[PDB]
Design a protein around this ligand. Structure first.
Ligand code: EDT
Ligand code: EDT
Ligand code: NA
Ligand code: NA
Lengths: 701, 702
């Protein structure tokens, strides 16, 4: 009666069966341990009691088809050169007599997890339909420890909370901190990817993959029975999805292992996404290391606005040439050139500039429709001169498209905006959606906006433009299909280190949650952790030591890496800055050395097309002691290794700038004991010795 | 204390003042008769995320007043006359609200035929960004007048009119609200504008608005106890009624009044209150259009918009129409279109409209489908290039059709490519449509959001030198003066409904007093075969009109855009009557409203622009109408060849609609004629100045 699906290695077993009332039910075990207790699958549809609204029970198995897939592919950019997609599949065709319609639930079981989705075939009795609620259950076998953030339709910029599932309800109120756009939905609602640690030694990750033509999935916890259930984002009318057969829901994933490191190594999310749709991607999509006129405005030292004498702005009417400069506008030609010089002097690829265009005076919280035109520069920003100058220095300018959440306005100006970028040498753009969405009533993660974010990415691909979108729906592996989407923030980033700070263990969690599905533009690299040095009125302190900031270039994976501090501060710590300069952006191999969510993450990566390795470790409040074994290096080879570590007396709060830099030789026989301070870590560059002269005067570490 | 404003002719007097609580209050009299009793003006604002800030309705002090007189004449690109005089006395009142330390301005403009007022919000510290919860502009009536109205609705204006006392509206609302794919009535006593009324003391009052831009559409809600109509704006998806940013103004609110119904039609207050033409070269490309089209086929059900019927649904870019089976009813096919092109060219028409030419029609209705059309990919049987080549050689222009199925983001995303496609393939005019509930879902057809879209579409079209006729859009308020390329809108119950059960017999005797105020309507008149079952056996709908009345509509339903809606085959059966449609002009140098009584009859004579030719039309209600015409408006000493197309004896819209007579003779400014319009009938007359005695040969005086 029931169907059994097993992973290639036999460790995981997914059992499927329709219960007595016709409800599709599944369960999952790992090494004979229950991971998912009997859980039902189905959806309730909006009424056009009407039986047609029922798409959750009264089903009977019409057909079952199995299959095995085992193919390897190569991402345009990633944590490794090649990814293996190996799974056993079970597709179940379910017929519903009362409605004379069928659906298919496809299961794909890998050695590290399970993925499933619903498929709605074109048929006489199922064409256009609206989803009221998706009812995908995830029954937990116990009151696990979770690493979560409040379920919210508009923001994911919350600090994580570590607690038992039974404790979420009582911590929700405090976990929900202020934000310009936020719509929490439940006292027990959380976002995905959700990370958990069980008492019987398992690590479980609940998430989704290929979120396309559908609303974002959050999870709502029944904290009495410990059952998580899909909770989609509603549109302006409360509906959760306009569908038209043939169509499918995104995949829902359960990644599990008794070794936390395997959670990080899993590629289930990417494997479940459609293959690359950009035929010539390889010729133009590429990693980017950059700096930018940014931290100035984030800390309050400088401003995005050109003037402070206007009550409001009317684009096309307000004549900025007649306004008085506020003396704080960082986005001015001379200043930009200084950044370009620094960028070129240290091997950076691009320079981001925010506040270059008209309109910033009204960018925040006004729910303004015609807020930006994305093409008209302020009087002090010479677009052409900056382009000529940047090109002369071998630098590329990164365009900035803050939309202030006015989406129709952005779409109306998009083609002209992208054409302006093309005409002026910008091949990458950082977009933003700060504020409540316009059309008013919609949320940042509903089906409507998900369509927009992808629309912006697909159009960008046509212009050979790469995109990094802040405030957009968190990633679900779509980068595989559209590799020009080199980033998103979509989580609490370094900017909040300027707004009071991020929890000390923040970066020891992000890799297990946010990063699953795509890279994050975290903008690490702050050396002067006291923001009051940028702006006297800003008393925020970055919760990190300098060594840990260096580590993030390896522990916070991304093909897009920013060195966020200002040039002046890097010039003060030029020796430590060398690691940021040296670190690669793309990798042929990645080895997860140590990993425990909320405590520590140590990773070693092999720079693409080289035999150079880079290591980074980020630790929580208890610090961490590592016993590194460099057996991943090549036998018979020697490497010039530079170790950037916390000083014995380092502390994120009391002594964040105390670090040591040691240079020596390493081989696959080398071993090192390193200690990461409280809120600290370390970084190591390991370069293969090409010429004997390189090792000249160096000894083993 | 009171402020007094008088019309240039002294017949109207507007009195303004703030009451004891500081509430702006105005009133209006006409020839010493109360038109507007003391009525309050103001707005309530949405609370921000000091409480008193939500108050923008009282606590005002008159801080300053400024008067002025304006008297200038201007010429519309197209219209009912060559020149329009804009003459008014103005009173601008600056109102200061101490509690919020902010001021607003209410500007009043009084014409000899009505009053117009609007609120102005200057840029200031305490008034920058604000959201309107409700506008509270009152219009206090002096009695239980008779009104010609349609249900207040955020999504449709395609209702038949109702004639009743104000006190009878509440009880008639339920039946007045008939079925429609997208409708959102808001009150048991809510009505739309322009609202027309007739008073017991001989006055005719019209309540409306002008220059609806960057604001939500205004409807009226009746307090039937005190007989006070009050502005009721269209809410957005979350219930709000207007996102404002100073400096900004509300549209104008108008009260047109006279003791002669004809003056209501003659009033140009609406156009006069709109901003001057913003299209500098308009005269070089904006032009009237008389057309026919592959349309009535689908409307009656004889033909279809869809190419095939074998698919349960379609997906653009995936569905391969070249592999589907033709349903055999697709009227938008090359061969058929060429037949229309031949007819149009043969009879002097300017363009041919074709609907159902593009992929996607299989799913066009009520699916709330986002990616419903791409506006550029033709069906397998519609050869865009060959149809263009043929039309051009024949001197005919193809009129593009852009039905959006109310999927607005989709239309905006495809708009530039769509307009460029038009430019690349010889189309310079487009008929757009918005059938179905709006997408973004939650918005209404007339909210501030869609009003922005409709104008965005028109402004962009102007850049491509394209003219627009938008169906289902917010009813016009004179914006055509600013953007002359907006040559039309339906935005009211049109001829298509004569195929869906019919329109009330008196419908066209009301539209000119209501819908037409603010802009022309693409009513698509000209149905000669009034029995729809002749088109489609299963359609028993009958057009409520005689053939003669249909001809009259080309004069009584003003528009620079005129369609001859019936199929060529039917016009060929009545080619003698068809002559009037062929002869009638589209633009006029002069217009004389001969007879006019809302709901009963309308008789108008117009002088074709740049000619000495006149055209007359009369449309009547269920009681018919006998006219005693006096042609003293014709030039003295001139002879005219007149052709009278009238209802034959015993003609009747229901029992004998095709009974008509045609008489030809000579007319002079001394001629007098008595004509009778039958029940649901009327008449049409072409009056051409004799240019050669040979034209009079054989003709006598009528
Ligand atoms: O979105 C799809 O499903 C398929 N088509 C549909 C048209 N797109 C417009 C576009 O991609 O520019 C509609 C949309 O993205 O919503 C486009 C594509 O992605 O290749
Ligand atoms: O709409 C305005 O107020 C002024 N600008 C503003 C930009 N427009 C975009 C456009 O017209 O293409 C915004 C809008 O129409 O909402 C345009 C115009 O000349 O009307
Ligand atoms: Na952010
Ligand atoms: Na219509």
């Amino acid at each position: 009666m029931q169907q059994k699906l097993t992973s290639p290695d036999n460790n995981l077993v997914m059992t499927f069966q329709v219960d007595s009332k016709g409800a599709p039910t599944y369960e999952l075990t790992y090494k004979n341990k229950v991971v998912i207790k009997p859980s039902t699958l189905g959806l309730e549809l909006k009424k056009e009691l009407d039986s047609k609204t029922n798409l959750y029970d009264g089903f009977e198995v019409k057909d079952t088809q199995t299959a095995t897939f085992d193919e390897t592919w190569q991402p345009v950019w990633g944590e490794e050169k090649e990814i293996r997609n190996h799974y056993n599949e079970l597709a179940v065709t379910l017929y519903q007599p009362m409605n004379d319609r069928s659906i298919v639930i496809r299961f794909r079981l890998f050695n590290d997890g399970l993925g499933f989705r619903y498929e709605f075939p074109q048929q006489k009795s199922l064409n256009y339909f609206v989803i009221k609620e998706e009812h995908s259950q995830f029954g937990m076998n116990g009151d696990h420890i979770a690493f979560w953030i409040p379920g919210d339709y508009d923001t994911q910029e919350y600090d994580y909370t570590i607690s038992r599932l039974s404790e979420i309800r009582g911590l929700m109120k405090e976990a929900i901190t202020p934000n310009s756009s936020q719509t929490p939905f439940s006292q027990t609602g959380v976002q995905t990817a959700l990370m958990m640690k069980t008492d019987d030694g398992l690590y479980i990750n609940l998430h989704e993959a290929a979120l396309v033509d559908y609303s974002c999935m959050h999870l709502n916890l029944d904290d009495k029975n410990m059952v998580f259930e899909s909770w989609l984002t509603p549109d302006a009318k409360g509906d959760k999805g306009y569908m038209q057969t043939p169509c499918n829901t995104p995949w829902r994933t359960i990644i599990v292992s008794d070794d936390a490191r395997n959670i990080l190594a899993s590629r289930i999310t990417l494997n479940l996404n459609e293959p690359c749709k950009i035929a010539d991607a390889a010729s133009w999509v590429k990693p980017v290391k950059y700096i930018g006129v940014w931290w100035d405005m984030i800390t309050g030292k400088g401003s995005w606005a050109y003037t402070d004498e206007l009550t409001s702005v009317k684009l096309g009417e307000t004549d900025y040439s007649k306004t008085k400069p506020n003396g704080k506008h960082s986005a001015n030609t001379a200043n930009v050139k200084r950044y370009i010089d620094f960028a070129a002097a240290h091997g950076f690829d691009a320079v981001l500039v925010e506040g270059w265009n008209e309109g910033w005076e009204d960018w925040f919280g006004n729910s303004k429709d015609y807020v930006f035109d994305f093409v008209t520069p302020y009087p002090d920003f010479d677009v052409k001169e900056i382009h000529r100058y940047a090109a002369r220095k071998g630098i590329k300018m990164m365009m900035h498209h803050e939309t202030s959440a006015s989406v129709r306005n952005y779409e109306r100006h998009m083609d002209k905006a992208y054409q302006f970028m093309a005409d002026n040498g910008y091949n990458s753009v950082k977009s933003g959606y700060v504020g409540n969405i316009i059309p008013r009533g919609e949320h940042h993660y509903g089906q409507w906006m998900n369509n927009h974010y992808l629309y912006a990415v697909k159009k960008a691909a046509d212009y050979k433009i790469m995109v990094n979108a802040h405030e957009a729906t968190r990633p679900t592996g779509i980068c595989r299909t559209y590799p020009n989407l080199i980033g998103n923030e979509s989580a609490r980033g370094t900017e909040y280190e300027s707004f009071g700070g991020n929890k000390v263990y923040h970066t020891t969690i992000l890799p297990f949650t946010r990063l699953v599905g795509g890279p994050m533009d975290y903008t690490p690299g702050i050396f002067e952790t006291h923001c009051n040095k940028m702006n006297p009125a800003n008393n925020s302190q970055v919760r990190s030591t300098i060594a840990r900031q260096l580590a993030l270039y390896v522990t916070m994976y991304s093909p897009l890496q920013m060195a966020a501090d200002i040039p002046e501060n890097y010039e003060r710590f030029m020796d430590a800055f060398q690691f940021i300069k040296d670190v690669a952006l793309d990798w042929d191999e990645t080895n997860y050395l140590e990993a425990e969510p909320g405590e520590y993450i140590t990773i070693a990566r092999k720079a693409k097309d080289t035999d150079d390795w880079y290591v980074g470790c980020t630790a929580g409040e208890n610090g961490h002691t590592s016993k590194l074994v460099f057996d991943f290096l090549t036998p018979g080879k020697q490497y010039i290794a530079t170790v950037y570590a916390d000083a014995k007396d380092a502390d994120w709060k009391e002594n964040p700038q105390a670090y040591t830099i040691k240079k020596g030789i390493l081989t696959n026989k080398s071993k090192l004991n390193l200690h990461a301070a409280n809120g600290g870590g370390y970084a190591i560059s390991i370069k293969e010795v090409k010429d004997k002269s390189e090792a000249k005067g160096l000894k083993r570490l």
